[PDB]
Amino acid sequence: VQKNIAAFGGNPKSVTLFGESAGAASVSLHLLSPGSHSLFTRAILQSGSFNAPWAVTSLYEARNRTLNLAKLTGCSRENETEIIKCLRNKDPQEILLNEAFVVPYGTPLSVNFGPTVDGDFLTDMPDILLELGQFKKTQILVGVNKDEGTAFLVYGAPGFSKDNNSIITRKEFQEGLKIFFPGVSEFGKESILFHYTDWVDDQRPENYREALGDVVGDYNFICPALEFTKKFSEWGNNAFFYYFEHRSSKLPWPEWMGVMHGYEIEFVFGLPLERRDQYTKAEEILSRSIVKRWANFAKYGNPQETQNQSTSWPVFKSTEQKYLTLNTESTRIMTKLRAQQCRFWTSFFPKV
């Protein structure tokens, strides 16, 4: 892009990266990598950031897994360059079939082979780079979906199914935590149970179904994005945070899964602007507005919609922690998203 995009009529000095989930984590690692500094101007992170628990493979883990993969492909050797030569004669299917087993227990969030601290793209642990302000100084737009966690529950959590309302019991919730927090002490799991199963009240039969989706989405997406946004803004740059809370009228997944992970993307990319396509009018309007907001952020670093008396998007600062809600009904300014929950994940949880 730097080298070629002027030939296509583009400005190589005005590039915004955007991405979702692992792509958002990727964007946040380009903010940390000094070889990427000159290759872009600004960044949008949709439901992901490199400080999410799934986003970086530790050095210990990567070694175990490389060796485990070798063992499984009949490529266990002593000279390491030689493990690699052996893996290069395996054909892709053989490598793919074995990847799932290089960990002894996956979850629906497993990232068996992800970013590492390689001393090249990434010179140090990224939590340290973030905390101490070593990253590209520029504006960011960050956000998450109201029900990040639900999509993951139908790939292994007991009593969940896309084909019924997935009302689960206490015991099912507990086995659920076992599925998502493989090891994870007893005490670590109870403390999650304790933080999320304090009912006001009723008892609503959906309590535990809702709680486990919140547990998975707060831990894996929402709290890490909020912490990234806050640590990044502390170094002086403008940041903007959204909470996406609109459920596509065409969602093929059931109602209890709510505003799922991944289901803002088609709004960002403007699919509801196509009338022939069976989205509602309110949804054309919402996508029109999001598209304008993303565009204005890329061209101008400010994700406002300035023409149609829209709610002004305040910058996210670490004191007040303002964010904007994106929905078809009332767009609001709100403060301190999931404050109680993220205090649990962010301060208490990493010590267990």
Ligand X SMILES: *[C@@H]1O[C@H](CO[C@@H]2O[C@@H](C)[C@@H](O)[C@@H](O)[C@@H]2O)[C@@H](O[C@@H]2O[C@H](CO)[C@@H](O)[C@H](O)[C@H]2NC(C)=O)[C@H](O)[C@H]1NC(C)=O
Ligand Y SMILES: *[C@@H]1O[C@H](CO[C@H]2O[C@@H](C)[C@@H](O)[C@@H](O)[C@@H]2O)[C@@H](O[C@@H]2O[C@H](CO)[C@@H](O)[C@H](O)[C@H]2NC(C)=O)[C@H](O)[C@H]1NC(C)=O
Q: Is 195 a catalytic residue?
A: no
Encoded amino acid at 274, one letter: E
Q: Which of 30, 195, 246, 261 is flagged as catalytic?
A: 261
Distance from C-alpha of 20 to C-alpha of 25, rounded to nearest angstrom: 8
CB count in 10 Å sphere of residue 78: 6
Binding flag, residue 58, Br ion (CB under 5 A): yes
- 223: partner contacted, choices Br ion, ligand X, ligand Y, none (Cβ within 5-8 A by kind): none
Q: Which of 78, 91, 163, 202 binds its own copies (CB under 8 A)?
A: 202
Q: For residue 246, give every residue at least 6 positions away whose Cβ sits within 8 Å of its Cβ, in sequence order, or none.
A: 259, 264, 267, 283, 286, 326, 327, 328
Interface with Ca ion (CB under 5 A): 187, 190
Residues 228 and 131: beta-carbon distance below 8 Å: no
Determine whether 37 is an active site residue.
no
C-alpha of 302 from chain center: 22
Q: How many CA atoms lie within 13 A of 284 on its CB side?
A: 9
Q: Is 261 a catalytic site residue?
A: yes
Please enumerate, by residue number, every residue annotated as part of a binding site for tacrine.
261
Q: How far is the CB of 147 from Cl ion (least distance, A)?
A: 8
List the one residue out of 151, 139, 143 whose CA is nearest residue 225. Answer: 143
Among residues 20, 26, 148, 305, which one is catalytic?
148
Minimum distance from residue 229 beta carbon to ligand X (Å)? 31
By CB under 6 A, name the one of 4, 38, 203, 307 that touches ligand NAG.
Answer: 307
- Residues forming beta bridges with residue 142, ordered by sequence position: 45, 241
Closest to Ca ion by CB, 137 or 171: 171
Stated as kind and residue range, the H or E segment containing 226 is helix 223-233
Residues annotated as catalytic are 21, 148, 261
Applying CB under 6 A, the residues found at the interface with ligand NAG are 79, 81-82, 288-289, 292, 305, 307-308
Applying CB under 8 A, the residues found at the interface with its own copies are 119-120, 123-125, 127-128, 131-134, 187, 190-191, 194, 198, 200-203, 280-282, 285, 296, 299-300, 302, 304, 306-307, 309, 332-335, 340, 348, 351-352
